[PDB]
Design a protein around this nucleic acid. Structure first.
Lengths: 129, 116, 117
RNA sequence: AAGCUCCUUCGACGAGUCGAGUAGUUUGGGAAUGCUGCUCAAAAUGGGAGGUAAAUUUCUUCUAAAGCUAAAUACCGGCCA
RNA sequence: GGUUUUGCGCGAGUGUUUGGGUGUAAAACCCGCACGCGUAAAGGUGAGAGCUUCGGCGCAUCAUCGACCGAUCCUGAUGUAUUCGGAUGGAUUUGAGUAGGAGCGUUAAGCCUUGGACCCGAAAGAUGGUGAACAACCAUCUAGUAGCUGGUUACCGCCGAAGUUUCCCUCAGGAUAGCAGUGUCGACCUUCAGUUUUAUGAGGUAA
């Protein structure tokens, strides 16, 4: 669209960055990330550690998980695998459990610098309603 | 616990003689249904089927009691000349007539409004 | 639920901080009157009645006479040295008795009693 | 004058009141939720209120019909700020 | 007091402000136990955004085939205190069920219910008083209430109607769908069309 509804200035910074990327690269990943950055909070539901742990199963354990939402901790998950996740926000228990398992935590600008086009990324959405 | 022989002997201590060859029907005025009233009711929750099953049992009882009283000659038919007191006061039957006439005019007013 | 004249019975609370100041000044006045003494009396540990709150304990009204006698504190001296006494409560078990007796001897271990004159 | 301890000695606790019937009034409240008027009118290992299907009303918890008492609470009025 | 949506913080948790402590004193700062609400008490196949070492991996969501449970329908195990229990195989089963949580608090806007309730506007009724002389007046309840009138305050821009289908029952009416708009998802000139053509329907109707 024309403007994000968010008043977070850093969100608008991410929107400017991914507008530039979507314009100057032929990568559908950047366009999808920009579209999800424009979207509202109810349309960006929280993604739990267990849902990522399920999706990191076949050959995606070496891929970088990208979540345009907040990753939340799941108490049902007893063992957290090693994971490189790039998300808007992390809850304190989720970030602590990811880093305690040898994994890593990323923001979207570090993703845009390390992976400008989204090569070998795993885009994950949270459950609707 | 079910101490069955105790229940039989206690019944014997308190039984009166119920035998159609010895005592007449009017003495006990008791008739027992042949059907066990568990097959006529599939589920307990529906009131209509349970009530019509109880209706069937009491209708069986009423028919057999009427036949036995006709054999006995004891009067059965309450005639219109006999006036006695009522189980509930005539205010209560005034009230039940009042609701019957009220729902009668409610239904006919609905029908007339659909006609109009 | 505004069927009655609720306009004549609205209670606002613009005097909440003023009442807090009043309560703190009342505690200060109690401190001024009872200068070395604590402003509160000692109260026993009791178990909450119902099954829902049976797991937790709270402060009671006053110590039982058996608890005071077992702790070595006479009944008539106890209200004059800061201990609350409740003649209605009963112990009913050897586990509340021991707990409140321990509380009373702990209070006795940390008390500075002054002579009458 | 006073507190405590001990015991081959004692230990008095509120009646036209409870309660039953009945008519009002009131309550979320027929163990009448409470109160009042009329008629009758108690008890003493008693009385009140609860718990419980659990084998019979087992058990539990208090003492009515006498009285006093600060604080936390209310406040369109009084003396002010 | 409910409900929808935008922003924000934290997030399976969230909410300091009843209160306590503190203060430069109705501010700001801190929080001990509760309490409210919520959470607790992973299968196959096919599409599918995106990624790809070009081999494939496949979010959310949908369809379909399956799995488990509260409970229901029989078959009725070892066993059983000897009158209790449900093991195996079967059912066109349900659910506000499970199948890897989304909520809590706050702000802004809109809508609904109740309070005087967008503003003004009866006849009345009740309570308590004032007078007379063959009901009247005064104050309050009371900003009473019912219908039905009148009125309802700057500008510009963009989009823009209906006066109908169906259902039920008061008569004094609502619900549903339609016309207008918003968000999300799925494709994307694939597909769609108040249209022609081809075959086709009732008219072989005229000639």
């Amino acid at each position: 669209r024309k403007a994000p509804k968010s008043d977070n200035v850093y969100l608008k910074l991410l929107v400017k960055l991914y507008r530039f990327l979507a314009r100057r690269t032929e990568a559908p990943f950047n366009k999808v990330v920009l579209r999800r950055l424009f979207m509202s909070r109810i349309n960006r539901p929280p993604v739990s550690l267990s849902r990522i742990a399920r999706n990191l199963k076949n050959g995606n354990e070496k891929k970088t998980v990208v979540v345009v939402a907040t990753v939340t901790d799941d108490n049902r998950l007893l063992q957290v695998p090693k994971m490189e996740v790039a998300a808007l926000r992390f809850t304190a228990k989720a970030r602590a459990r990811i880093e305690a398992a040898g994994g890593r935590t990323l923001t979207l600008d570090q993703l845009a610098l390390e992976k400008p086009t989204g090569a070998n990324t795993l885009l994950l959405r949270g459950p609707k309603n | 616990i079910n101490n069955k022989e105790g229940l039989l002997t206690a019944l014997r201590r308190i039984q009166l003689d119920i035998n159609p060859k010895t005592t007449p029907f009017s003495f006990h005025q008791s008739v027992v249904a042949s059907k066990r009233t568990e097959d006529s009711i599939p589920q307990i929750e529906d009131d209509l089927q349970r009530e019509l099953a109880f209706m069937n049992q009491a209708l069986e009882a009423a028919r057999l009691g009427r036949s036995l009283l006709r054999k006995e000659g004891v009067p059965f038919t309450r005639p219109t000349d006999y006036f006695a007191e009522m189980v509930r006061t005539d205010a209560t039957m005034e009230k039940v007539k009042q609701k019957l006439i009220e729902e009668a005019t409610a239904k006919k007013a609905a029908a007339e409004a659909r006609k109009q | 639920h505004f069927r009655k004249h609720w306009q004549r019975r609205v209670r606002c609370h613009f005097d909440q901080p003023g009442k807090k100041v009043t309560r703190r000044l009342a505690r200060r006045a109690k401190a001024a009157a009872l200068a070395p003494r604590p402003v509160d009396k000692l109260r026993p540990i009791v178990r909450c009645p119902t099954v829902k709150y049976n797991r937790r304990t709270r402060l009671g009204r006053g110590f039982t006479l058996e608890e005071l006698k077992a702790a070595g504190i006479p009944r008539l001296l106890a209200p004059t040295i800061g201990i609350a006494v409740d003649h209605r409560r009963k112990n009913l078990s050897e586990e509340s008795l021991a707990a409140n007796v321990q509380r009373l001897k702990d209070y006795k271990a940390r008390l500075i009693l002054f002579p009458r004159k």
